[PDB]
């Protein structure tokens, strides 16, 4: 749709000058479309990382809320939660870390 | 579904549907009929009654309503629409008449008339004798007709005279006629032959002849497949149905028994032409389904034609039928008409 | 020059009506040796222009060969439907270049090889709507209509002018779709066929045109 | 005929002037480039500047409403006003070339 719309304007520009600039207008349409393919990869990656973290959080919280207390003892259950908390924190205390994950991460740290 | 019979207190020789507007989505709403063997014969326009409704006071408005009439002269031997307001009819008087409907008035009128289109001759004076005009076929703005005089005429809906006449195209009666192509027609006769004529040829003699083998079965009716200009169907004096490919010798390709009598009309379905319909002096009306085009198989014990009597009884003679979309109509000597809105339910 | 000479001769024996008496045999009909030689050269031409862009342009541009006008002119003449089919295939290979196609659409509409402009006094149609129903539907073989469907099948992908037929009729495509739908397609199961395969060879080249016409059309509010 | 196909029309006219040749193919071929433009998508309008700039139109400032289709009509008008000595043949040629392609005649050409 974006390609159809930008090409429609590069048809609507009725002039001298536009019809000398038309190659460069199609070339700048090519960089805009490549950036938008990048934007579409970014949104699908930020979905997939977050959907995986939500699936992982769902698995951890069933191990904690629904499995019997006589299948993970009072010390190993504590070590597992102490270690999971420290690993779940560092991946969000690093400054490259995607902010879309923070509502899942704090949502896990609360249950932990 | 069930079939809505109506007495009209005249014998019906012919029935025809009003042609639908090209690219409409209507069913066949209106039909025309012609009558025979009265003290007074007529041509009439009818609507199909609406079986879908009752209003508060409980009246049955579902009758096949008469829109308008006009009186004829002679018997209505054959009948066809010419456009969406005009009709053409033949006569026992040898007359051919074009009529016009008036939707703003609900009346019929004459539009043009050829009072001496068909006539028998005699030795040396123009005291002509009446020859029944037997069949009519239209190719607007052009028209063709046949009769007991063995004459073929070509007429026009802008011209008063004949455009061409061919006297004695047979020494016997010619019964029916159809267009293979716009200058090229086919006729049937008292001998059991199909004669083909080209109005481009400057002689009066036939361009081709077909027949049965030797023994004479008069051929009363003819039609030609809507999307095969070479496939023809004819009906006999015996109740046989003959399918022909006019390119492949002198004989029919397929020969079927359809009635215990004289078969008065045969028609291919105008949109579904692997379907066929026939009526007769045996008092029955039939549908035929066959879905090479199945009509041209030389072994109907391998390839199918599956065959249905549309009337639940035998009446006095069924002279005529017409079929348009899901609608079918027929006309009889029992002073009656039969109609359905649906043939596929 | 041979195509121009056949056009020049065939268009001159035309039957002036008053001449009703004993003609001899017209010793000006193309014999099979020239027909099958013209078919071989049309098929050579059609292969060359099917591939080379340069060879479509540098034949259509030629002011003394003018091949589109000569070929459409021969298609109006009483030549056999097989020679008309290889002439139509030569146009179907020319019509790949969109400059050729845009001029060919106007030239087809002007030459009435399908009659889009049906006159109110006229009984017989003219063009391929007669030749299909009055020649191919006698032979039980369909080379002319299949070559016409193939001509339209190129000329949809090089596109059609929106003003096609303007001033002569309402503008647009549907008169060609009426022929392909209501005279070819709805009539492909009725017809008889000497080639039991050609019942399907006709179905391929019509459903291809309908597929292209629905592939590239996107609905807009003006359609309504 | 080659210069006319390239669209080098004023050098084709200069060659017709050094060899007495008729300008009729120049007027028909320029009209046929105008017909290709009048039904032309935007590539045929990008193609047009490259031959319009060869026909020395350098005295027109590029106002931003100047359609390539109509500088070709303007060049054809200028040639039909520049070459007056035989002007029947060159109007007859251009109009026959437009009408054989169904193109309505410009208000200035009539």
Curated annotation (Swiss-Prot), chain B:
One of its GO terms (cellular component) is kinetochore. One of its GO terms (biological process) is protein transport. WD repeats lie at residues 7-56, 71-109, 126-165, 169-207, 214-254, 258-291. Keywords: Acetylation, Cell cycle, Cell division, Centromere, Chromosome, Chromosome partition, Kinetochore, Mitosis, mRNA transport, Nuclear pore complex, Nucleus, Protein transport, Repeat, Translocation, Transport, WD repeat. It is found in: Chromosome, Centromere, Kinetochore; Nucleus, Nuclear pore complex. Its main location: nucleus. Pfam families: WD40. SUPFAM superfamilies: WD40 repeat-like (SSF50978). InterPro entries: WD40/YVTN_repeat-like_dom_sf (IPR015943), WD40_repeat_CS (IPR019775), WD40_repeat_dom_sf (IPR036322), WD40_rpt (IPR001680). Component of the Nup107-160 subcomplex of the nuclear pore complex (NPC). The Nup107-160 subcomplex includes NUP160, NUP133, NUP107, NUP98, NUP85, NUP43, NUP37, SEH1 and SEC13. Component of the Nup107-160 subcomplex of the nuclear pore complex (NPC). The Nup107-160 subcomplex is required for the assembly of a functional NPC. The Nup107-160 subcomplex is also required for normal kinetochore microtubule attachment, mitotic progression and chromosome segregation. This is Nucleoporin Nup43. It comes from Homo sapiens. The lineage of its organism: Eukaryota, Metazoa, Chordata, Craniata, Vertebrata.
UniProtKB/Swiss-Prot annotation, chain C:
The chain holds residues 560 to 783 of 2012 of the full protein. Plays a role in the nuclear pore complex (NPC) assembly and/or maintenance. May anchor NUP62 and other nucleoporins, but not NUP153 and TPR, to the NPC. In association with TMEM209, may be involved in nuclear transport of various nuclear proteins in addition to MYC. The gene is NUP205. It is found in: Nucleus membrane; Nucleus, Nuclear pore complex. The modification Phosphoserine is found at residue 16. Part of the nuclear pore complex (NPC). Forms a complex with NUP35, NUP93, NUP155 and lamin B. Does not interact with TPR. Interacts with TMEM209 and MYC. Belongs to the NUP186/NUP192/NUP205 family. This is Nuclear pore complex protein Nup205. It is linked to Nephrotic syndrome 13: A form of nephrotic syndrome, a renal disease clinically characterized by severe proteinuria, resulting in complications such as hypoalbuminemia, hyperlipidemia and edema. Kidney biopsies show non-specific histologic changes such as focal segmental glomerulosclerosis and diffuse mesangial proliferation. Some affected individuals have an inherited steroid-resistant form and progress to end-stage renal failure. Expressed in the testis.
From Swiss-Prot, chain D:
Transmembrane segments: none annotated. Disulfide bonds: none annotated. It comes from the Eukaryota. It is found in: Nucleus, Nuclear pore complex. Signal peptide: none annotated. Functions as a component of the nuclear pore complex (NPC). Involved in poly(A)+ RNA transport. Part of the nuclear pore complex (NPC). Forms part of the NUP160 subcomplex in the nuclear pore which is composed of NUP160, NUP133, NUP107 and NUP96. This complex plays a role in RNA export and in tethering NUP98 and NUP153 to the nucleus. It is linked to Nephrotic syndrome 19: A form of nephrotic syndrome, a renal disease clinically characterized by severe proteinuria, resulting in complications such as hypoalbuminemia, hyperlipidemia and edema. Kidney biopsies show non-specific histologic changes such as focal segmental glomerulosclerosis and diffuse mesangial proliferation. Some affected individuals have an inherited steroid-resistant form that progresses to end-stage renal failure. NPHS19 is an autosomal recessive, steroid-resistant form with onset in the first or second decade of life, resulting in chronic kidney disease. This is Nuclear pore complex protein Nup160. The chain holds residues 1217 to 1326 of 1436 of the full protein.
